[model samples]
Target chain A: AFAHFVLIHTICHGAWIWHKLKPLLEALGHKVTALDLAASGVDPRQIEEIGSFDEYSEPLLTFLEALPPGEKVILVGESCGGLNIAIAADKYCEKIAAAVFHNSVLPDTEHCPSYVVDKLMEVFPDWKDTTYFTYTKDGKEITGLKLGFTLLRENLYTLCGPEEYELAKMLTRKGSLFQNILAKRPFFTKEGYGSIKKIYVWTDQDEIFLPEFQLWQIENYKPDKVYKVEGGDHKLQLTKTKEIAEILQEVADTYN
Target chain B: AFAHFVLIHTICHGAWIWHKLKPLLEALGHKVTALDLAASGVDPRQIEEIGSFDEYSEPLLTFLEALPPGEKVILVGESCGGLNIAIAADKYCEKIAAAVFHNSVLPDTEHCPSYVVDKLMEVFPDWKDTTYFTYTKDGKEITGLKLGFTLLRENLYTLCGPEEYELAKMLTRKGSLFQNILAKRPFFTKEGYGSIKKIYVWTDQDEIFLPEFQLWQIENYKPDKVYKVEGGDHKLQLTKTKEIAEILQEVADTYN
Candidate 1:
């Protein structure tokens, strides 16, 4: 069976984190495509410089449109990318088989004013200004201290022995802020809700998208399925890459 | 330190409705004892004649017991009892320290089968003859209309905002059959985790404790707090009530 899976990253982070899982998905005889959103990953620029939501969605949208017309692909969004995938699913549901969210922020159409995105930013100021994007005369690149290490220590890696914490820290990567802002914006249309079979892969112990908030978002949106990881942090790709890959494969096998 | 508070009934409700809340302990006051949990000018028999969770709890437990020996009396429960207080506390949470919820059910607890207890009884042939000790010997003492009205109205009122739905036409006083088994059985103690000092309630929303389960029997355990409501339907009471009260009384007033 011909199958393809597209992986999108959350705000601040990029496709680099999916490094561990991409090969695994490819190894399973599936074509895997992981790309960084505009101004995310190595692209350094302010959100204002990136222009509107459409500009930020351009990269993913272009890639999605270029896919073979009849071949359905599973779209995986991490964190803020959930919003992007939602928009894509709305516009191109025919080309996409399903949308998988990895501890992502689901679009809050009904109660967007009082959503968790604003509440969380207020509590964690660092989430807004994290050093991921940099400005350049020409093209920009994502640059910052490794986020996986910081998140691992704060959320999941601590439970492991100290040796494991160090190992996890070594694998951490810098993240971007411009992508974060773009992800926070709501983009779900009625078409999006109707077209995509949404699934939530929750990193239950994620400090950024806390379990309580994740549960709230999932309930608010009412997705098709919710897969929980008991001990992973926000950086599941770094900490539980194999498990995430297996989960994606299982979901693909069952749903697609 | 001593404190006092006034209860305001919502639209269509009267101060007499506070009979359920008055005797409950106020965390800020040691000597204060409010008394609406007694026979009122309206009629003691009328209050007693209504066989509902509030009636049972107000008379038998909340008023009769001395203030709990602690800095605060935790409101406890699950389900609608959970959600009502949540909205109530939207108005206030003064004179309360915190709420401690125990498997509390709230209005939004996911899948709640019984919008009203009576309808659930009608659907389940096995639950028809279940025993509710309060009414076994003295069914005649409690007016069937009052009991039926409370069962169908107050409990399921949140299911839909509508006022006129067919009330379930059943008579036996076996309030909840499922809760009886859970309170007595020790099937999943390992599943119980996390503790918060605010409200404690139970949800018949739990598949294990279907609506046919008696909430009163669960209350007999005398959880530090109790709330029962619809929604996810499990700990609705804890999910909604204590938080509102705390927000209004503590956070809103003191901080805001």
Candidate 2:
């Protein structure tokens, strides 16, 4: 049966990464939507424009609001997306069929994590590297804090070949830190956000999150069902598009 | 100016999605790599086979360990990949040029989020007329979640044509959720991870993470540059490949 799949990506990344899956999900005749949150994906905005959680999550919040009453969606979150989608799930539990976290971050806090922000600050720097960005504190150019480009082959794309690696390199963009890392107070309820079906797609080849972590999540959070994949990458949707589509179908079948 | 690019995908996705971007970046003479984390990607693994973080991150961790002395690679993290690359940046600061989070997650927590897990639980069910999964909970009968022919004409693929959508449908496989969603404790030192360059690619159309959210990230995490794209989809990479390639080139020029 066809269902509505709302694909959510993590922190700084946008919806652009969902290209391959869109068609696959659609071919199955599903309502596949990889949203570009307010400024995520190809959506545009300035960091200065956003100040509060309401402003940051407005796009998705409104998207859910606009949905027909009881028009549930198969909400899928990847990476940090679990946390982001969790907020929507809390507010629009009436509109979700199943919420799937695919090697993603689980929503644990109401707001963003201060620790994550602090660490990001610890990485990346270069004053002469003009292509790199520069943050200012009252017009003073912050130095030695910039994007770090290293070890991606090992950290994110081991299974991906050189061609794929290059393509990813080109497709990537420098994302926002404030919105991608900072935390805010989140709200939910047992009757609303906590009433929907949930699933966790676990991978055995992930280095970013690790297998133990997946198990920990399952044990601590406990999803309705936990689907296991033999060997896959952190970017499951893209690397295993067909498999993911089928999983979505299965979730749609069972949960929706 | 040729440079090494290591591409990282978020939770549940693989490196295969970078197909269109390869030729563009390679034509410009850059070294590109898309890595599949040990437990991530379709690389191959048994969860029981991995016991610890080292085992899980072995593939990537060792990749960094094996890097030539003072030979740096441009690390790119997508989705939750920011957290991943951040860990690497800390351990191998000497081997990184710049780190880029393209719509990705920032690593701030010791483990995965629980609220994300809790909300995910609120979304599905195993009612008989299941449109979601064919899970026995012990084993899978369906190679994938075989989907129904419906809703493809709406949302994401609207920008894509019927032919493209159909082709993607054909291309979609039974994705692995097992290796997609999960997390573990990450480690890093400000002195180490902090030394690398960083960037946050910001977008506007993202209904997934929203604009204010991204801005929040920039304000907190702080990147060298927060590149802005006018408009595209969640899967903007495939849709906006050429432009992304140009941006990558520009960053390579500045950061490398």
What's model 1's overall lDDT? Answer: 0.47
Best by lDDT: 2
Candidate 2 segments exceeding 4 Å error = A52-54, A109-148, A161-163, A176-188, B1-256
DockQ value for model 2: 0.07
Mind giving the per-residue lDDT tens digits that candidate 1 earns over B1-256?
A: 2333323221112232222233332332323222222222111232334433334234324432434444333343323233223332232343244433334332211223123233334433342222334332134333221223444343433342111111111111112222222222222111111122243334555442354444533433333344454443222322343433343244212321
TM-score of each: 0.41, 0.47
Candidate 1 similarity to native, TM-score: 0.41
TM-score, second chain, candidate 1: 0.27
Report the lDDT of model 2 for residue A118. Answer: 35
Docking class of 1: incorrect
- Highest TM-score among the candidates is held by which one? 2
Candidate 2: CAPRI quality band:
incorrect
